[PDB]
Amino acid sequence: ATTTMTMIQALRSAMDVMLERDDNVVVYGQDVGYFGGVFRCTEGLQTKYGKSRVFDAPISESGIVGTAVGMGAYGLRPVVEIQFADYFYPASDQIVSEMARLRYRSAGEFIAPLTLRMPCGGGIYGGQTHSQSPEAMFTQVCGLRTVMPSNPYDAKGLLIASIECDDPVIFLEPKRLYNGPFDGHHDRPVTPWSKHPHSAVPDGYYTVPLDKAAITRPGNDVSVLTYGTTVYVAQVAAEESGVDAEVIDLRSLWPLDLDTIVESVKKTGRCVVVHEATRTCGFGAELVSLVQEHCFHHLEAPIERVTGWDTPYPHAQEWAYFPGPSRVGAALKKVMEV
Amino acid sequence: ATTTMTMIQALRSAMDVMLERDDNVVVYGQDVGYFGGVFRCTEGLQTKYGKSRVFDAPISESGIVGTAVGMGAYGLRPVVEIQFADYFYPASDQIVSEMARLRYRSAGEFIAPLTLRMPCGGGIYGGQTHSQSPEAMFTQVCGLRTVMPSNPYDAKGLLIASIECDDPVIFLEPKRLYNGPFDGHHDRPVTPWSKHPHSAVPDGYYTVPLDKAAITRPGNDVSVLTYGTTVYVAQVAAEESGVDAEVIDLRSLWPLDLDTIVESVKKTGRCVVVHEATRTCGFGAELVSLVQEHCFHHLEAPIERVTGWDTPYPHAQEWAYFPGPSRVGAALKKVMEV
Amino acid sequence: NEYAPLRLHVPEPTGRPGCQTDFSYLRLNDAGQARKPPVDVDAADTADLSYSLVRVLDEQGDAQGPWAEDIDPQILRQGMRAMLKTRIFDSRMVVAQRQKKMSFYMQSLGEEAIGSGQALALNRTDMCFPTYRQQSILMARDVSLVEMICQLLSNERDPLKGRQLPIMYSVREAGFFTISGNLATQFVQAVGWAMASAIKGDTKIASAWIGDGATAESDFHTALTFAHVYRAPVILNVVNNQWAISTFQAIAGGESTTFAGRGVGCGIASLRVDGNDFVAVYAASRWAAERARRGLGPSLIEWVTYRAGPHSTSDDPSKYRPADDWSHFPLGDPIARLKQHLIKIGHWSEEEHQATTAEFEAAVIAAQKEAEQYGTLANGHIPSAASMFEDVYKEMPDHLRRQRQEL
Amino acid sequence: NEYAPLRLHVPEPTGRPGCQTDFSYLRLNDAGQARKPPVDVDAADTADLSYSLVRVLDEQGDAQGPWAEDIDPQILRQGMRAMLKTRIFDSRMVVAQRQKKMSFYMQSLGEEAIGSGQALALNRTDMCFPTYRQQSILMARDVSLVEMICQLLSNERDPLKGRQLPIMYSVREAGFFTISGNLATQFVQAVGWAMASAIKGDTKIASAWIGDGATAESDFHTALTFAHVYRAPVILNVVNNQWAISTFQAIAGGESTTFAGRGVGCGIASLRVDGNDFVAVYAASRWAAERARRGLGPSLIEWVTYRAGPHSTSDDPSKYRPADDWSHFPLGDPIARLKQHLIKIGHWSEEEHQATTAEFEAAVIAAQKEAEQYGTLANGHIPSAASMFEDVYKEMPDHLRRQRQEL
Ligand SMILES: Cc1ncc(C[n+]2csc(CCOP(=O)(O)OP(=O)(O)O)c2C)c(N)n1
Ligand SMILES: Cc1ncc(C[n+]2csc(CCOP(=O)(O)OP(=O)(O)O)c2C)c(N)n1
Ligand SMILES: *C(CC(C)C)C(=O)O
Ligand SMILES: *C(CC(C)C)C(=O)O
Ligand SMILES: [Mg+2]
Ligand SMILES: [Mg+2]
């Protein structure tokens, strides 16, 4: 059957499905056990499957990822969490130097079928260590697979799919979209998921193929490359600018769906990249570099990108940093200009 | 006066000058003390200035950078080393979460006038953890200053300049260029520095301004954006292709000299980016994204980039990975094509 | 056959909601039972101390043992003032958090004695590297309540210009190092600050802080390592309040062990002190400050206390531990115990208690009102947006200038 | 005035080139003096053991004490064979390194007993997480010399297909986990492997390794923490050969302390054993294997040895320590001591020693010749260039396919 869930509830369902589908699936991290997670994403999972399957861990990122790597070497499928993406740094070495290169350097003898869930994104008065977007620290790592959903349905499918993949997967989860969609309007109080599209999630097993982007708003004017919270910001911003922009939610940052992208810009003739992360060397720099390579001639204007400023995430100036429907919309016009 | 030195000897001179010029300058890291460094870069510095100025440290990157941050908070100017850039990961958190954001989050109360020297680059049968180029992990960090020299003279000036800068500086040092220049030809045994241009280094104090790139080979055909070992690879590759390509050695990865670059491509009308680092989300992706923004119309072809493959650095297949005069040269033609 | 199946061990607290915590796991000792070593004691001779408890004030409020020596009542009164001021400011700010005038706040209920006690045993020039729960230090050093509150509101008067989350203070003038949301990092940095002081032939020392949970963080180990190797003039404080959000200290590695004992293993003189015994906190801190300033090396102090309130304004203790927990904690309330002792020795009274309480309330209400006059979350009155691109680097690099104009 | 200037402390070795090292810093104990605890002993009761030395073979080659019990001569002969085979292969490969047939090599001179001894006390299915200096394990598990050498040459026959640096072996079939150039990371991963085994109700255990220098690395602490918290079935081995490249173990935090003592502080039963006493290495390893397999928890073992040769083929010991150092080391040569004891008890002879030596030399020379037939550094005969884009991911993602064709 089907039930209406929030992203939190969706992700929880995915783990519940896998924990039940694969005896080798394990879940653990800070406060993930008895408490059920600081975001409720793992509620009751320990009560239902036991301490040996879902449990609390010491405050050590490197230790969490490290033991998980050794666990995978044995033959387990570890789904581990990092309370906030802002706190993945301590696990940098284990992630880059170990998890990613495990299969390569061992010629397949040992593998890292691990999944690391990390809440990310801003727009919640989180501050410097409560709302950054480190996707660019991962996608440049040969051996990793970076994924980020934008709605309940996709959140479950991509997690179940990310979990089963035999490659290490960095599963980014936009905390901003945990309770409901967010377009970037703080004036208009936000609504839940039960009153919006894509909150209908199947109770059992199902997936959402990786390496496959998705068009959110079919358009012919401009190609909009994005993911996460800026997906709903591009949709609304397009409606405000009037621009018949095509909104593309990559879903899979890297590897990504190079065709669905080169195909939308091929038709359109212009694209704009939108992501929360800082600008310089952000993920948006790779998207731009690929578009300019497979769509140089069919390009009818300079490729634009609306992202966060090259500054640490502020608290007070929240709305001045976050690329909202406004600053984004302005971009949808600057590109449609001759 | 002046003396002929290798990069190793140049860098050693810079630290010798600063250690003597600023009582607040300190040098320390693994094997940096009594031994003088695994690359001899700090030879005799401890014997001349004492244990309290130059000393050996425990094998802890995070501890090395962390204590340095606290040292800067007190008021010292720490010049610290990381034997190999491949081993900076353990210090990721201290570098990104602390060193970079120290000035910002404290509104100037505390500062991190630190310098982190890290040998980088391949082309020496180093392997996966002996020759990577992590520049892209730093340049995307708001608050850092990434620098990389290409010859003795510049090596000293940029170090002395990097040291005095009041911003945290990640000083990358190409181990491949430590003993002499390298064009990428392993057949032709390599020569020292005393038999090549730019090995004449002043004995005393002097600097080489940051944020200022440098043209290595004046050209009108194509703009070549590079740094490090690929500087000498672009020069030779240009001579083999015959292409009158303009070789630009950024010297300062980020912040970079946006003008000297936009100005060479403005004239030329085409540019090619060359760096050892893997491709996807490498630093070359930002260079490409900026060129496409400030030089969209004056662009007479798709911007090309010759870099390392998206794979961990191999040992045996060394010469098949490293972007040598050949694979690069091929690029200088592909762009000059109609 | 021969070997039974291996099994995973996951530590659990004795008390969960609807139960009563059995606080036996605490390796407690009676007042005066622990000896007071010379400040030049060798690290190894501190082994027994690392697994005991330094405590002065007994059940009746009487001072017992060697740690009771040389204790000026005037310092205790300043202590009480500091503890009361911290708890009252804490209460007030939670309310302001609820009435949405503020974005986020963290209390230090039950821990007010630790930071205030050590602050008073050090010099203002001695730099502290605190976590987010040592506001008691700022109070002991009489920092402006108006400036603290402004930062908690991100006003136009926020000394941090809105760039940081509420309670992520920074007060260099009061030897209070810029707080970071990243756990443990300040522990190692404090050792560097001390190394810097020794390198310069100075006499200032560092005061590092970290909670039980964060001890599992890599920088904890790094701190002990460098502290020992270089004999750094730093006091390494571990505040064991039994919890780290919803996780009981056993999951941090506290089962059958103590956090002080980890200092002994890394060559550092260690002390396990009653964190809710102000006299004990001032005495042990003074002891460590002296060892360090005399160049006798670092010290590691485990403070045994209890996190009385929620982890923060976003937490709910009822979901993982007994709500009646603090009521049974063998070490009680720091403010209640100092009050009992202070009165019994003739240097405090029910009258002074209430009067002093009434003035901090007024002081806080006035400060809050004074601070609000510069903005709130409602009032869009906050720091400029152009100040947002400042201080990332000493001089605004071109790219930021561009981004500023583009706003 | 009152306080003298603080000063930085930088530990230095007693012996530098042109001097003689005073090995007094080693907290040594005579053979048989240390007791042999029950495998169920509590961590805390191992405190004294963490600061002593477990040693069997005395000055005369006689076995003393409780650790001498139940020791089959056949295991020692396999041991000797393993130690001789490791040292002979080591010598041969350095030569091949000089004659540029090879790119890089690392010896284990003087440490051959540690890894070979523990390997023999474990089961092949027990997974080891070695650093770059435990080749003795591969030898004890009779791994193909031809395949090892091919990897050291990056031949077309290199099992790692040239993707890794020489000596960065990987032999899952022999319970030898893929080596990484990043120090300490394997220590924590080994704990995870053990946690995995306990989670699955298995009976296999993990054998983790790390040198004195790397103990200062964050993952050392993380390993002890998780090992203790979950009571993981892992043997945590610390090889203290007194050096880490040019740095004396004191700079790693070894001054006035021991590495075993760090296990005690983190709730782990610990043992400080003579690393050049094979009998002691087999006995202590067997002891720890049993504690773990019985589900009695992890164990931490500090092996006191000495790095007899250069750090690697790129190092020069003469620039930082006495060249005559190993000659004065109180614990001598593992191969020489087992030889003396073995002969004295009637299970080895000068004749067997030489004969066995001669066969490993032939075996190595033949293996080298056999391996070279597949390539060298001279012979461009190496793995394909297209195999270079394989295994980065389970399935070659599009971008790599492109890069492959573009070659
Ligand atoms: C590196 C890192 N990981 C995780 C977090 C999220 N986190 C914030 S506070 C906290 C609890 C730490 O507890 P403890 O050290 O006991 O301090 P207390 O909250 O009790 O004062 C955690 C896990 C963080 N801030 N930094
Ligand atoms: C994270 C990291 N930092 C630095 C290095 C460089 N390095 C390689 S071996 C070594 C010495 C480590 O010594 P020890 O742990 O004592 O082991 P040993 O060499 O004595 O067996 C160092 C510092 C590295 N490989 N990894
Ligand atoms: C956020 C901020 C502070 C540490 C409470 C968090 O990680 O909890
Ligand atoms: C390189 C490889 C191995 C660890 C010797 C190094 O870092 O020394
Ligand atoms: Mg705590
Ligand atoms: Mg060693």
mmCIF file of C-alpha atoms in Angstrom, chain A residues 183-185 221-222 224 230-245 247 272-274 279 304-307 322-337, chain C residues 406:
data_model
loop_
_atom_site.group_PDB
_atom_site.id
_atom_site.type_symbol
_atom_site.label_atom_id
_atom_site.label_comp_id
_atom_site.label_asym_id
_atom_site.label_seq_id
_atom_site.Cartn_x
_atom_site.Cartn_y
_atom_site.Cartn_z
ATOM 1 C CA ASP A 183 10.808 27.839 -1.776
ATOM 2 C CA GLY A 184 12.847 30.437 0.083
ATOM 3 C CA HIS A 185 9.985 32.583 1.377
ATOM 4 C CA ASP A 221 13.672 29.061 -22.222
ATOM 5 C CA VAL A 222 16.547 28.159 -19.877
ATOM 6 C CA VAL A 224 18.193 25.143 -14.545
ATOM 7 C CA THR A 230 17.150 25.152 -4.492
ATOM 8 C CA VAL A 231 14.951 22.828 -6.552
ATOM 9 C CA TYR A 232 11.822 24.394 -5.091
ATOM 10 C CA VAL A 233 13.530 27.791 -5.276
ATOM 11 C CA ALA A 234 14.119 27.427 -9.001
ATOM 12 C CA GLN A 235 10.508 26.387 -9.578
ATOM 13 C CA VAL A 236 9.059 29.417 -7.787
ATOM 14 C CA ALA A 237 11.736 31.777 -9.088
ATOM 15 C CA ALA A 238 10.814 30.641 -12.597
ATOM 16 C CA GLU A 239 7.148 31.382 -11.930
ATOM 17 C CA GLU A 240 8.035 34.871 -10.647
ATOM 18 C CA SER A 241 10.303 35.700 -13.602
ATOM 19 C CA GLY A 242 7.672 34.114 -15.803
ATOM 20 C CA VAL A 243 10.615 32.487 -17.576
ATOM 21 C CA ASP A 244 9.673 29.073 -18.987
ATOM 22 C CA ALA A 245 12.858 27.666 -17.448
ATOM 23 C CA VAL A 247 14.238 22.862 -13.718
ATOM 24 C CA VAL A 272 21.844 28.554 -14.944
ATOM 25 C CA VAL A 273 23.357 26.598 -12.035
ATOM 26 C CA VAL A 274 21.886 26.984 -8.549
ATOM 27 C CA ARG A 279 30.884 29.811 -5.117
ATOM 28 C CA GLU A 304 25.274 31.668 -15.061
ATOM 29 C CA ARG A 305 25.320 30.321 -11.515
ATOM 30 C CA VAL A 306 23.462 31.587 -8.460
ATOM 31 C CA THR A 307 25.077 30.258 -5.298
ATOM 32 C CA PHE A 322 20.629 32.055 1.019
ATOM 33 C CA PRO A 323 19.938 32.216 -2.746
ATOM 34 C CA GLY A 324 16.203 32.883 -2.553
ATOM 35 C CA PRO A 325 13.469 33.166 -5.241
ATOM 36 C CA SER A 326 14.595 36.761 -5.715
ATOM 37 C CA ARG A 327 18.363 36.659 -6.293
ATOM 38 C CA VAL A 328 17.753 33.506 -8.350
ATOM 39 C CA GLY A 329 14.911 34.955 -10.400
ATOM 40 C CA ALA A 330 17.106 37.930 -11.277
ATOM 41 C CA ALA A 331 19.444 35.381 -12.848
ATOM 42 C CA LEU A 332 16.680 33.871 -14.975
ATOM 43 C CA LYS A 333 16.378 37.282 -16.624
ATOM 44 C CA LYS A 334 20.048 38.184 -16.928
ATOM 45 C CA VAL A 335 20.448 35.084 -19.124
ATOM 46 C CA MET A 336 17.350 35.702 -21.236
ATOM 47 C CA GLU A 337 18.904 39.046 -22.177
ATOM 48 C CA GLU C 406 26.402 42.408 -6.555
#
